[PDB]
Design an enzyme around this catalytic site. Structure first.
Site, PDB file in Angstrom:
ATOM      1  N   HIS A 126     -75.878  39.772  20.767  1.00 58.99           N
ATOM      2  CA  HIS A 126     -75.818  41.196  20.369  1.00 58.99           C
ATOM      3  C   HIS A 126     -77.100  41.955  20.745  1.00 58.99           C
ATOM      4  O   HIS A 126     -77.166  43.174  20.551  1.00 58.99           O
ATOM      5  CB  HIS A 126     -75.481  41.325  18.884  1.00 58.99           C
ATOM      6  CG  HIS A 126     -74.088  40.885  18.582  1.00 58.99           C
ATOM      7  ND1 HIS A 126     -72.982  41.612  18.985  1.00 58.99           N
ATOM      8  CD2 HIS A 126     -73.612  39.783  17.965  1.00 58.99           C
ATOM      9  CE1 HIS A 126     -71.884  40.980  18.605  1.00 58.99           C
ATOM     10  NE2 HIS A 126     -72.244  39.858  17.970  1.00 58.99           N
TER      11      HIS A 126
ATOM     12  N   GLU B  46     -87.548  48.619  17.494  1.00 58.68           N
ATOM     13  CA  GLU B  46     -87.447  48.700  16.010  1.00 58.68           C
ATOM     14  C   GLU B  46     -88.843  48.545  15.380  1.00 58.68           C
ATOM     15  O   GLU B  46     -89.067  48.986  14.252  1.00 58.68           O
ATOM     16  CB  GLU B  46     -86.421  47.701  15.449  1.00 58.68           C
ATOM     17  CG  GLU B  46     -85.712  48.208  14.202  1.00 58.68           C
ATOM     18  CD  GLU B  46     -84.703  47.279  13.540  1.00 58.68           C
ATOM     19  OE1 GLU B  46     -84.594  47.336  12.305  1.00 58.68           O
ATOM     20  OE2 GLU B  46     -84.030  46.502  14.246  1.00 58.68           O
TER      21      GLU B  46
ATOM     22  N   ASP C 139     -72.707  36.780  13.391  1.00 62.78           N
ATOM     23  CA  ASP C 139     -73.209  36.389  14.689  1.00 62.78           C
ATOM     24  C   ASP C 139     -73.728  34.944  14.621  1.00 62.78           C
ATOM     25  O   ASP C 139     -74.833  34.694  14.149  1.00 62.78           O
ATOM     26  CB  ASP C 139     -74.306  37.352  15.124  1.00 62.78           C
ATOM     27  CG  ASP C 139     -75.104  36.964  16.349  1.00 62.78           C
ATOM     28  OD1 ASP C 139     -74.810  35.910  16.993  1.00 62.78           O
ATOM     29  OD2 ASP C 139     -76.032  37.716  16.655  1.00 62.78           O
TER      30      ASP C 139
ATOM     31  N   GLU D 265     -86.316  37.687  10.842  1.00 64.06           N
ATOM     32  CA  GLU D 265     -85.573  37.985  12.081  1.00 64.06           C
ATOM     33  C   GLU D 265     -85.944  39.415  12.491  1.00 64.06           C
ATOM     34  O   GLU D 265     -85.202  40.361  12.242  1.00 64.06           O
ATOM     35  CB  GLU D 265     -84.068  37.756  11.882  1.00 64.06           C
ATOM     36  CG  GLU D 265     -83.291  37.611  13.181  1.00 64.06           C
ATOM     37  CD  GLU D 265     -83.106  38.875  13.991  1.00 64.06           C
ATOM     38  OE1 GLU D 265     -82.050  39.516  13.847  1.00 64.06           O
ATOM     39  OE2 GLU D 265     -84.015  39.209  14.769  1.00 64.06           O
TER      40      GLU D 265
HETATM   41  C1  HDG Z   1     -72.960  47.235  14.221  1.00 60.18           C
HETATM   42  O1  HDG Z   1     -73.688  46.500  13.233  1.00 60.18           O
HETATM   43  C2  HDG Z   1     -75.055  46.461  13.342  1.00 60.18           C
HETATM   44  C3  HDG Z   1     -75.723  45.740  12.365  1.00 60.18           C
HETATM   45  C4  HDG Z   1     -77.108  45.715  12.353  1.00 60.18           C
HETATM   46  C5  HDG Z   1     -77.846  46.377  13.327  1.00 60.18           C
HETATM   47  C6  HDG Z   1     -79.358  46.328  13.325  1.00 60.18           C
HETATM   48  C7  HDG Z   1     -79.835  44.977  13.821  1.00 60.18           C
HETATM   49  N1  HDG Z   1     -81.278  44.778  13.723  1.00 60.18           N
HETATM   50  C8  HDG Z   1     -81.798  43.551  13.816  1.00 60.18           C
HETATM   51  O2  HDG Z   1     -81.116  42.588  14.137  1.00 60.18           O
HETATM   52  C9  HDG Z   1     -83.275  43.228  13.512  1.00 60.18           C
HETATM   53  N2  HDG Z   1     -83.574  41.849  13.961  1.00 60.18           N
HETATM   54  C10 HDG Z   1     -83.567  43.381  11.955  1.00 60.18           C
HETATM   55  C11 HDG Z   1     -82.860  42.308  11.114  1.00 60.18           C
HETATM   56  C12 HDG Z   1     -83.321  42.263   9.639  1.00 60.18           C
HETATM   57  C13 HDG Z   1     -82.422  41.286   8.892  1.00 60.18           C
HETATM   58  N3  HDG Z   1     -82.504  39.875   9.284  1.00 60.18           N
HETATM   59  C14 HDG Z   1     -81.639  39.093   8.378  1.00 60.18           C
HETATM   60  C15 HDG Z   1     -80.934  37.941   9.053  1.00 60.18           C
HETATM   61  C16 HDG Z   1     -81.657  36.870   9.564  1.00 60.18           C
HETATM   62  C17 HDG Z   1     -81.016  35.834  10.224  1.00 60.18           C
HETATM   63  C18 HDG Z   1     -79.642  35.843  10.362  1.00 60.18           C
HETATM   64  C19 HDG Z   1     -78.911  36.896   9.851  1.00 60.18           C
HETATM   65  C20 HDG Z   1     -79.551  37.939   9.200  1.00 60.18           C
HETATM   66  C21 HDG Z   1     -83.375  43.670   9.038  1.00 60.18           C
HETATM   67  C22 HDG Z   1     -83.756  43.793   7.574  1.00 60.18           C
HETATM   68  O3  HDG Z   1     -85.191  43.916   7.465  1.00 60.18           O
HETATM   69  C23 HDG Z   1     -85.484  44.871   6.473  1.00 60.18           C
HETATM   70  N4  HDG Z   1     -86.837  45.365   6.711  1.00 60.18           N
HETATM   71  C24 HDG Z   1     -87.321  45.880   7.885  1.00 60.18           C
HETATM   72  N5  HDG Z   1     -88.590  46.201   7.846  1.00 60.18           N
HETATM   73  C25 HDG Z   1     -88.974  45.869   6.555  1.00 60.18           C
HETATM   74  C26 HDG Z   1     -90.218  45.907   5.895  1.00 60.18           C
HETATM   75  N6  HDG Z   1     -91.334  46.421   6.443  1.00 60.18           N
HETATM   76  N7  HDG Z   1     -90.275  45.429   4.632  1.00 60.18           N
HETATM   77  C27 HDG Z   1     -89.145  44.993   4.057  1.00 60.18           C
HETATM   78  N8  HDG Z   1     -87.910  44.938   4.570  1.00 60.18           N
HETATM   79  C28 HDG Z   1     -87.898  45.368   5.839  1.00 60.18           C
HETATM   80  C29 HDG Z   1     -84.382  45.910   6.614  1.00 60.18           C
HETATM   81  O4  HDG Z   1     -84.242  46.723   5.456  1.00 60.18           O
HETATM   82  C30 HDG Z   1     -83.162  45.016   6.867  1.00 60.18           C
HETATM   83  O5  HDG Z   1     -82.459  44.673   5.676  1.00 60.18           O
HETATM   84  C31 HDG Z   1     -77.160  47.065  14.319  1.00 60.18           C
HETATM   85  C32 HDG Z   1     -75.777  47.109  14.334  1.00 60.18           C
END
Ligand code: HDG
Ligand code: HDG
Lengths: 330, 337
Positions: free
Chosen positions: A267, A119, A18, A110
């Site tokens: 998205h 979430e 994305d 993020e």
């Molecule tokens: C069809 O495909 C799909 C793919 C994904 C999704 C869910 C989308 N959710 C989001 O976009 C939310 N904003 C969360 C994004 C972050 C990751 N951000 C990374 C990033 C940043 C910038 C650009 C790209 C990517 C989650 C991580 O956060 C982790 N996490 C969440 N809560 C905690 C926590 N308390 N401690 C540690 N890790 C945590 C979780 O395990 C993860 O791995 C739905 C559909």
């Protein structure tokens, strides 16, 4: 279930590819490189580690990358393969439960979901401020929730048609109609995730700002959003539409990430909460009320929306079950 | 989360308005009215109670309708509304944990998932036979899993198109290439849910039958399906396709519910498990091996498929997890070879 989902590379890929999301974060970080150069960074929920890599590109001295899913293993692989073992330190675990060796200059994450708060990851982001130095910054720094009344008779009738299944006095010989009320209630508690033409909006949006430098984790358990709309068009109001922007307020420039319906679809789409009973309003009337989000156990919210047309006393009281959204986009 | 999902009227409605489900069950019950008239019935996972209403239409004396989600509250409302409180008793709870006041003549349920066994509800269905009278019946009575080898080069090459996202040395300046192997492996581990043209099948299907009157709950923890396919077509074999039928074997007649690709499409679709290493076979060759389904903690199965072309010794060994299926169905007409 929750951290199991994020253990899949496919989900990380889907977020990374994305470009508005990834590209905007990279611009926010690199164009504010003085906020990173020689600084200590905490990346909350790092996934693959992509934001930690951006912080390293911008010259961070040390980045603690916290990740609770098995994706931490994969982030470790990338840190080693990118020769950044001296600069990015993956710390496997929940940010609420891990130990960090020092305080940080800036927290990056993020954490945004549908309607910003879905979430409940912003609670973890704000929790992480226990590690933030007094002079410290957060990226994103603020989030603006926007809401506006909309008209969409088609969507209203779509959902009513589904609920009306439970009006049937003889479905294969069985009377379902005792559940008519329960079914209408359930369907109209579903927030509708999709996009729409901006011409369906009946008033200028109202903004609710969360300042992440100031907000406390507990504050997100009860979020009260007051609104007063000046109706620009006459007609039936079928509900409120929601979207959000976040700003990265750096020392060199502010960069915005917007999910508004005037901007390229993202998205996050947009979210609409329907009224069981549409309200009529005339252009010039005011539509006032309060959106109350109450945190629940399913990493989501029970939403209460009460809206009234001030001039007539026409009132709509509504529930939204953000656990059970209707993904309409086709 | 599992039972929370089933507490939504919308979910129950989706299954009720599925005519191949609801219509087939109604026909099986009403056309076998002698199996139900003045009989005692157990309905396992009744949801709204629809099948219990069909048992009552067929003249059942007493139906125990067991439902573990909060949908049991709604079922009770319907039983009252329909003036059947004397004949249908809604019992909230898991069939494994509740008590019945007597043994039953027949058990009815709709416990089928993808590839028949997914969701693991057949274990609850078989568990319920603790309440079945010695010579009692079960509806469905038997389940047939069908498997056949397929060729689908485009589906196969999609896995690499997706995985090769990671084979980039400077994705926003980051070298992702060390995770490409892991990505390939993850995509190939996903069983593919969608339909296809029958002309992609390269041999007659092999059938594995579970007789629910004779099977025990533990039989479903480890399911070993041997196969020997005699190839009708020459080509690359990209994997195995799966579908299933169940039969309701009543005293009056047998009614089938089929999810085969020769039949109208159902919400079970069909399931394909790819080989990460495809196998070259010519018509007349034999493709032999074993599909082992090992129950796991997520109401699903680890799938192990091993296949070899006997004439060449060329072999393919594959692990899948049915807890992470890829829903590929779009609606566009399937293509033959
Ligand atoms: C069809 O495909 C799909 C793919 C994904 C999704 C869910 C989308 N959710 C989001 O976009 C939310 N904003 C969360 C994004 C972050 C990751 N951000 C990374 C990033 C940043 C910038 C650009 C790209 C990517 C989650 C991580 O956060 C982790 N996490 C969440 N809560 C905690 C926590 N308390 N401690 C540690 N890790 C945590 C979780 O395990 C993860 O791995 C739905 C559909
Ligand atoms: C997009 O919409 C969707 C809607 C639903 C689904 C899930 C599909 N699953 C199935 O079709 C499985 N075969 C299970 C069907 C049965 C209900 N069968 C009802 C029926 C029968 C005939 C015709 C129409 C409808 C589940 C009930 O079983 C309950 N249940 C499961 N295990 C137990 C148990 N051990 N004890 C009690 N109840 C149980 C569960 O709470 C439930 O309510 C996915 C997507």
């Amino acid at each position: 279930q929750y951290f199991q989902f994020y253990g899949y590379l496919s989900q990380q890929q889907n977020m990374m590819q994305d470009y508005v999301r990834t590209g905007t974060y990279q611009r926010a970080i690199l164009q504010n490189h003085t906020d990173f150069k020689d600084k200590i960074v905490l990346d909350v929920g790092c996934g693959s580690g992509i934001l930690s890599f951006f912080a390293a590109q911008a010259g961070a001295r040390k980045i603690y990358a916290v990740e609770a899913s098995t994706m931490a293993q994969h982030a470790e692989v990338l840190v080693k393969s990118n020769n950044l073992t001296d600069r990015i330190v993956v710390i496997p675990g929940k940010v609420e439960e891990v130990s960090l060796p020092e305080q940080v200059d800036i927290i990056i994450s993020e954490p945004m979901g549908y309607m910003l708060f879905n979430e409940r990851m912003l609670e973890s982001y704000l929790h992480a401020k226990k590690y933030l130095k007094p002079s410290g910054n957060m990226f994103p720094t603020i989030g603006d929730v926007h809401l506006a009344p909309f008209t969409d008779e088609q969507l209203y009738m779509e959902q009513f048609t589904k609920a009306n299944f439970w009006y049937q006095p003889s479905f294969h010989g069985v009377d379902l109609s005792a559940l008519r009320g329960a079914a209408v209630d359930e369907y109209f508690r579903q927030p509708v995730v999709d996009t729409f033409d901006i011409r369906i909006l009946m008033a200028k949006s109202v903004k609710y700002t969360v300042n992440f430098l100031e907000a406390k984790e507990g504050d997100l358990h009860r979020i009260e959003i007051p609104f007063k709309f000046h109706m620009l068009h006459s007609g039936l109001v079928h509900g409120l539409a929601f979207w959000f922007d976040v700003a990265f307020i750096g020392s060199i420039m502010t960069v915005w990430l917007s999910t508004a319906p005037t901007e390229p679809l993202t998205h996050w789409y947009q979210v609409r909460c329907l009224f069981q009973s549409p309200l009529f309003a005339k252009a010039g009337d005011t539509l006032s009320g309060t959106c109350l989000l109450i945190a629940n156990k399913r990493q989501s919210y029970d939403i209460s929306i009460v809206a009234q047309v001030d001039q007539t006393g026409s009132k709509s009281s509504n529930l939204l079950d953000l656990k059970n959204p209707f993904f309409r986009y086709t």
